[PDB]
Amino acid sequence: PTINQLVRKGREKVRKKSKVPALKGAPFRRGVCTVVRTVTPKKPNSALRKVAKVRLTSGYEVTAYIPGEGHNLQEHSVVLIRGGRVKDLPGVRYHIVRGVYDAAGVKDRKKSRSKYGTKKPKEA
Amino acid sequence: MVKIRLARFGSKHNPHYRIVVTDARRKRDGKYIEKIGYYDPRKTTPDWLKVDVERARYWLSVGAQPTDTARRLLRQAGVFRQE
Amino acid sequence: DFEEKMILIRRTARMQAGGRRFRFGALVVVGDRQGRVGLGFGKAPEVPLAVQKAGYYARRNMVEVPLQNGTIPHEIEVEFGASKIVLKPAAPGTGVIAGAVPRAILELAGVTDILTKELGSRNPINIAYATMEALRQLRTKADVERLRKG
């Protein structure tokens, strides 16, 4: 564009849209489970991914993924949302933090324990 | 009434003052009108007190009122000597 | 004498009745770190043969780089295809700040302090080619002097 045009309209700064509206962008947000369903992923995957509807304190009701081998989440299970998309589950943009609130850490896990919230086991 | 007092600079347990000319009503470590010396109460260097008598003499000549301690440092730096 | 650095080797594919037939391509830089570099892009059914040709084509594609205390005598911007490469003269102790492809050309050319930037299409092939051209277009006060004397 001519410099004149630039003086006339200038350039437009490009904004960025959040991938995780868990308000205040806050690192995490608290919620209560509404449902604890199971879900089938999109091509070319197949399985029963574990999901939960959470009624966030932010005033939102989003679908959170429950990582780990197995879980212990019922309805009124209060939990912490952190935000992490699940690639094959369109719609799931948050992960549930294991080890906080009613969500148990993953039992028996020995490797990436920081994630999955699993205290270190001692030996003999 | 304007003052010639000490403003604190340094670290915790490590004070270093600036002999300063500031309005009495202003914050201690606030905006001062002029710096005219410095003081290291711990004398960590041979140079723990400089003043510049010429300027200090000026402010006194216009109503500057020194704090008791500011006065002692000023004296020690020959500000009031007259012999 | 001549040191060789392999820029990239790739397995390309052609199609035939019943199945696809392969072939390899290799980019090789050669230089004495004394001011001479050559680029070669050899292709053959096998990697090794590919690299062989690469080297060969390179030695007959040498360029005279006017080093001046480990650096270039002036900035040049060369565009090759949609690839653009920028070369800026730097002082001692800067090193060769450049991406893998142009870096290899430059080091083997005996450049030790240079500033660069890859713009536009970063196709290694075309960037490799833009670099050689840049070095090739470099001139020296002397050269300018003879061009303008007469």
């Binding site: - | - | 001692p92 102790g93 090193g95 700040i97 893998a100």
Partner: protein, 208 residues
């Protein structure tokens, strides 16, 4: 904490002799003797063409494992060197060679840089007369690096300083075996140094 663990294993990975031990890393046994292949269950298999990154990283791990410093510490020094006027490369080595714990080693008061570190921390060393137990202390040209009088009669200080008798020292230093003193004459040039490191590759590692 500065590492603390199997050391003649780091030598093996770098495929080069790192005299971390010292006394034993001389008498055919630093493992780099009849076992110069990296440690691990796969240690003897053929290695693949290391990636440029890999090569820069290994070289940086080499130089840094020599002075036995942490990455945090090591990095800060590099930065200090990038700022400083002059070739941000030789300077960097110079700074490393100025660490007290290192100079203590270069003057042979200790056998290794690890052993030299403990000697400083335990206060058996002195700069310009005053005690100093800071391994990271930077020795400036002109400083005198002696041994605590109260230490001059230490089983270890005698033995090491004894064996130093007759041996020459870095062109930039100067020992006094008798009085157990020494002087940091000048920052060594790269020419004065002679370690298995390609400094440039380290600068490159931190440009990425």
């Amino acid at each position: 904490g500065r590492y603390i663990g199997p050391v003649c294993r780091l030598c093996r990975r770098e495929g080069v002799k790192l005299y971390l031990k010292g006394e034993r890393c001389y008498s055919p046994k630093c493992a780099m003797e009849r076992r110069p292949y990296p440690p691990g269950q796969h240690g003897q298999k053929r290695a693949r063409r290391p990636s440029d990154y890999a090569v820069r990283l290994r070289e940086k791990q080499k130089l840094r494992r020599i002075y036995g410093i942490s990455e945090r510490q090591f990095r800060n020094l590099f930065e200090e060197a990038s700022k400083k006027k002059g070739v941000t490369g030789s300077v960097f080595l110079g700074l490393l060679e100025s660490r007290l714990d290192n100079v203590v080693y270069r003057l042979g008061f200790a056998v290794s840089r690890r052993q030299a570190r403990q000697l400083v921390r335990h206060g058996h060393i002195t700069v310009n007369g005053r005690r100093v137990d800071l391994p990271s202390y930077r020795v400036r040209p002109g400083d005198e690096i002696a041994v605590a009088e109260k230490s001059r009669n230490l089983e270890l200080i005698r033995q090491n300083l004894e064996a130093m008798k007759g041996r020459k020292v870095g062109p930039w230093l100067s020992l006094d075996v008798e009085g157990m003193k020494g002087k940091f004459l000048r920052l060594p040039d790269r020419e004065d140094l002679a370690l298995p490191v390609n400094e440039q590759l380290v600068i490159e590692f931190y440009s990425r």
